Design a protein around this nucleic acid. Structure first.
Length: 58
DNA sequence: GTGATCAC
DNA sequence: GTGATCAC
């Protein structure tokens, strides 16, 4: 569960500040990987994933 | 190619 | 079972 809002571009193309429903890190052995959040487009109700800032707490 | 996640 | 999310 995320808490702080994230500036994302939604699939519908708009700039939004959304609270991710789930957050996690995806990274292979030996490498930094990326932090990802699961978001819900409030305008379409559809789910999408988006990169999180590197210092976003998991 | 590899990592995690889950709506679909 | 996978699309799609990114960085290395």
């Amino acid at each position: 569960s995320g808490k702080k809002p994230v500036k994302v571009k939604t699939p519908a193309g708009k700039e939004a500040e959304l609270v991710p429903e789930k957050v996690w890190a995806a990274a292979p052995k030996g490498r930094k990987g990326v932090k990802i959040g699961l978001f819900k487009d409030p305008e379409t109700g559809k789910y999408f994933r988006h990169k999180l800032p590197d210092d976003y707490p998991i």
